[PDB]
Symmetry: C3
Subunit: 221 residues, 3 copies
């Protein structure tokens, strides 16, 4: 069942990537770079999850799905780039702020991987450093990044705020599920966590980019 769910995920990612490629052929004032990012995220995630379906992307008394971290270390920084470029649409780019988000995010994912390989109190030291990184990412998202969005007009700002809330709501679920599942307190069962880390990413990757790109395309008129 776990294998079949991962095949299904990969096929959905493929369909998402094809959809974004089609959208790219009629870009409606959205730079090609934003279509490329929207395509890379699902294709990379699909390949990582395919490795799990084939029984390669995990090792074992606890089962570590290490392929998830290989996925996120590429997919999550690209999602923050998409969010940052949304705020800066039609205005000057602030690449320093964008790369600050990339740095925080990559660190966040690495701490998660190390926490998963750690035992006892050490696990929760690494987990905590990752949570602090997420908090700073959210402060940037709703603070300085949102102020850039406002400087680019009411229509863009409203779209940015919608996508920022969408992303923020989904992202807080990952460390919550992690802590409750076998990697943390073990209150939730493996099958439950597997289902969460199938459903969340579909909304986080394909769903986010549909909402993000449709909003920006609508600003063309």
């Amino acid at each position: 069942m776990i294998s079949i769910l991962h095949y299904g995920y990969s096929f959905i990612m493929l369909l998402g990537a094809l959809y974004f490629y089609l959208l790219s052929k009629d870009p409606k004032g959205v730079p090609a770079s934003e279509y490329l990012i929207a395509m890379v995220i699902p294709l990379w995630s699909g390949a990582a999850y395919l490795s799990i379906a084939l029984g390669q992307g995990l090792f074992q008394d606890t089962t570590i799905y290490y392929a998830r971290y290989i996925d996120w270390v590429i997919s999550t920084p690209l999602l923050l780039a998409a969010l940052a470029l949304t705020a800066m649409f039609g205005g000057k780019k602030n690449l320093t702020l964008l790369f600050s988000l990339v740095a925080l995010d990559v660190f966040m994912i690495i701490t998660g991987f190390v926490a998963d390989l750690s035992i006892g109190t050490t696990k929760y030291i690494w987990y905590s450093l990752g949570v602090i990184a997420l908090i700073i990412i959210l402060v940037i998202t709703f603070g300085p990044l949102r102020r850039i969005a406002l400087s680019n007009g009411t229509r863009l700002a409203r779209h940015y705020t919608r996508v920022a809330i969408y992303l923020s709501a989904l992202w807080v679920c990952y460390p919550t599920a992690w802590l409750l599942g076998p990697s943390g307190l073990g209150l939730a069962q493996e099958l439950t966590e597997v289902l969460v880390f199938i459903i969340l990413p579909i909304f986080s990757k394909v769903g986010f980019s549909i909402v993000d790109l449709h909003g920006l395309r609508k600003l063309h008129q």
Copy 2:
């Protein structure tokens, strides 16, 4: 014999790097970036293959020898070669970094699938191999499609040089997955010594040979 062939490769890479450095001192209208790229490719490849010569860049996976150092080489050297190809098409014009990074993304994925296929057993090997081949096909479509159209927009002489280097690169690159499939990593129709010879000779033409042809053509446009 396998060790000595790898030492020989590394020394040739060093000589290639030195030649490109010399060319860089009298650049003839070619930006510094393109000389830097031409130098990094052979120096990185040389260091990787040196690790094989010293018996470090390989391990035994059951009954087969995996030359993992080749993948460490290619994951850096192949995206830089595609960058050189892309910058050739864009010589005299605006850079399209989105198209360049699309090629880099496809290429890195291609090399990774190759490494995973080599570590895989049975049908799973050929799933990963197939994803890599599809990535190569898309790279070739970009090379002879949109990238070639950019070359045309930069004039007849540049376009003619681009088309020549693109064909040279394309011809050599299709040989890699062919050799891979026929050798011990695939169907095992070819012996280890045969595969080793191919993955010594191909890279010499793919790395040093390609950059000689590429840089000489661009330098000639200056005159």
Copy 3:
């Protein structure tokens, strides 16, 4: 004691990063990118050294202890330090990204050769070590040659600050391969405790110390 020293290092790195963040709030003509670089270096180094304190960032190879977390640190922290040095030379002028990325390429190779040398036995160790030393020599040639000529093209005051920072960096960097060769990874003339102390004290001056001198000088040009 080895664990306690690494905790202390990590706390100092955190304080360094906070100081640079504060400086960034009142930038005095120094672009945000240079404050970001100064913050990432100590934060990344702090995290790597924390892994050593917790007994995770090391393993026992042959009959020696490899502190592999040092290489994870340096492969990110050292290229960012060279970027900071390159941007100092180019302050008030056109950026030369080709020269900057040449330094990054040399540096990453240098750190990788060091890691492979540490994992190597006999003659092979000194082949990898030597390739790394040659990389450092070329970095120093760039620092005092073409990079210094760019600094001169940006005026006397900038050039004087650049020269001071370049000497500061160069003096500290030559100590690393020297300590490496003398310690358990090399000839084993120096004891583990001695090497641990050197690779605690050097990085404090190399990371936090360097950025204080570098940023204060550039701020003073305002």
